[PDB]
Amino acid sequence: QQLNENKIIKLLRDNIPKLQLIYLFGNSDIDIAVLAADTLDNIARWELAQKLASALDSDVDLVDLRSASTVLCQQVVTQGKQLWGTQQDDELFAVKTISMYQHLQAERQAIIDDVMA
Amino acid sequence: NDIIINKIATIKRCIKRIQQVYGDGSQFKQDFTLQDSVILNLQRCCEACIDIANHINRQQQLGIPQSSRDSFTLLAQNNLITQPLSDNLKKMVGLRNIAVHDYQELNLDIVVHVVQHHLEDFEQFIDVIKAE
Amino acid sequence: NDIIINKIATIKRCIKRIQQVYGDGSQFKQDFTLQDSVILNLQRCCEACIDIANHINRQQQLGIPQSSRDSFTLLAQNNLITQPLSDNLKKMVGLRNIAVHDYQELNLDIVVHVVQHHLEDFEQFIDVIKAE
Amino acid sequence: NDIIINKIATIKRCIKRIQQVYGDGSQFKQDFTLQDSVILNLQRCCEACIDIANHINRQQQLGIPQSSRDSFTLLAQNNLITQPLSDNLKKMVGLRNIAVHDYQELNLDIVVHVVQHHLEDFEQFIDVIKAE
């Protein structure tokens, strides 16, 4: 398992320029999230996900924490293990996501109340 | 509906405030109070647009929003607003999140360009939603 | 903590901005621009306090709050800040929401009273978090 | 919980998509594109139901589901759903596998029967999970 983590870390670092954070969350797909100084190209992001999946012999979802939704970032913050990156960036991203998720929960409360009877 | 009317009036008032306070824009980079007023009224416009979009999504059960930007995506893929207008409103939502959540140094040139070229998007959104 | 340091610096700058723009308060209820500036800086103070509360809650593994007021509630339940300070900060959050989202008629007298008597709550929160 | 909300919203979206693309059914058995859309959205409904069932089995610690059908058996054993509803969801389980491949001559009648008689089962699962 730890050997699998190193493959993920090095594969992401060797293909993502100016990479800042690598989180691992989630026999099906391996759930990886990344934050860099830029937003990954959608097609290129999926291509890197498929490269990771072929290297690990298991499905892989690569989450761009710069373009992903607030709910997904909140899930990654709440359960994701940080594989790579400084703790300062981790704390910054965590507090950003928590504050934005609180404001969003304030925003979308009526819709959730309506759809859930 | 009445909530949509109130939020449309709020957007119009905030746009008038932005246009009145900005002036010719010479003293913007110099007066911090002017910048504060313009930023707050832009944020208010974004909040009112988000509230309108969320009320419409709740009225028609278009789904739940995954983010503040998503509140307009759920409109775009329902053929209620055009993709360029949706993308511009999502740009406004990104600016608003930058302003209030402070996860990046706020860029004043972006603010000037949005004031000069993106309030038209708020008025287009008013036009589109008014004929509900 | 560098994040706490930067957030405290933001709160201090915004407190100074509120105090300077308000001045003696003779033109406050007459000039909407000063009102907008003070509202925006109060929002900045509130958001920075909310971010600090969320950071401290995640750091000490006290729980991830669903609302911004729940973060101050957690800080109080864990005896990190006092209940009166927690209630004061949560009512400041309520004032910010009133002023920004406009779900009730904004009372400028409350903004004046907060400028006169309630910035000390931000100062006290800074001094309590500083001596962690 | 956000997972359950999103999965319920996805089931609702896919049921609306099925009901819209199918229409009255006069053009369905003639156009293969409508059949493809209906098959895909039915499989999406079934997969989302299985996901909700597995998440509830893991949440309330009802047991370790040996299969995707056993995930509904765990819900039925603890009287969270009725046995007829569990058996109908198990019916839907076989729908996704059968409709993957392109034996059109058999599955067409089966897909029509499912669209006519088994969307109420998805809605009923949505309703009974909603009460949690």
Numbering used by the authors:
A (entry chain A): 2 to 27, 37 to 127
B (entry chain C), C (entry chain B), D (entry chain D): 2 to 133
The authors write:
Our subsequent work demonstrated that the HEPN protein with a RX4–6H motif is the toxin which cleaves mRNA in vitro in the HEPN/MNT (SO_3166/SO_3165) TA pair in the model psychrotrophic bacterium Shewanella oneidensis. Furthermore, antitoxin SO_3165 binds to toxin SO_3166 at a rare 2:6 ratio to form a hetero-octamer, and this binding is important for the antitoxin to block the toxicity of the toxin. Specifically, structural and biochemical studies of the HepT/MntA TA pair (SO_3166/SO_3165) in S. oneidensis show that the GSX10DXD motif of antitoxin MntA is responsible for transferring three AMPs to HepT and that Y104 in RX4HXY in HepT is the site that receives three AMPs from MntA. We found here that MntA antitoxin acts as an adenylyltransferase and catalyzes the transfer of three AMP moieties onto toxin HepT to block its toxicity, representing a new type of interaction between the toxin and the antitoxin.
We determined the crystal structures of HepT/MntA and HepTY104A/MntA at 3.08 and 2.6 Å, respectively. There were four molecules composed of one MntA polypeptide and three HepT polypeptides in one asymmetric unit (ASU), and the complex formed a hetero-octamer based on symmetry analysis; this result is consistent with our previous report. During structure determination, three regions of the unambiguous electron map connected to the hydroxyl group of Y104 in HepT were exclusively observed in the structure of WT HepT/MntA. In view of the above mentioned results, antitoxin MntA polyadenylylates toxin HepT, and in the final structure, a total of three AMP moieties linked by 3′-5′ phosphodiester bonds were accommodated in every region of the additional electron density map. Y104 of HepT was polyadenylylated, and a phosphodiester bond was formed by the α-phosphate of the first AMP (AMP1) and the hydroxyl group of Y104. Interestingly, detailed analysis of the AMP triplet moieties of the three HepT molecules in the ASU revealed that the orientation on Chains A or B was different from the one on Chain C. For clarity, the polyadenylylated structures of chain A of HepT and chain C of HepT were extracted. The AMP moiety in Chain A was twisted toward the cleft formed by α4 and α5 of HepT. In contrast, the AMP moieties in chain C of HepT were oriented to MntA. The analysis of the interaction of HepT and the AMP moieties revealed that AMP fits near the cavities along the cleft access to the RX4H RNase activity site. Furthermore, the highly conserved R70 that was located in the positively charged region of HepT forms hydrogen bonds with the first AMP moiety.
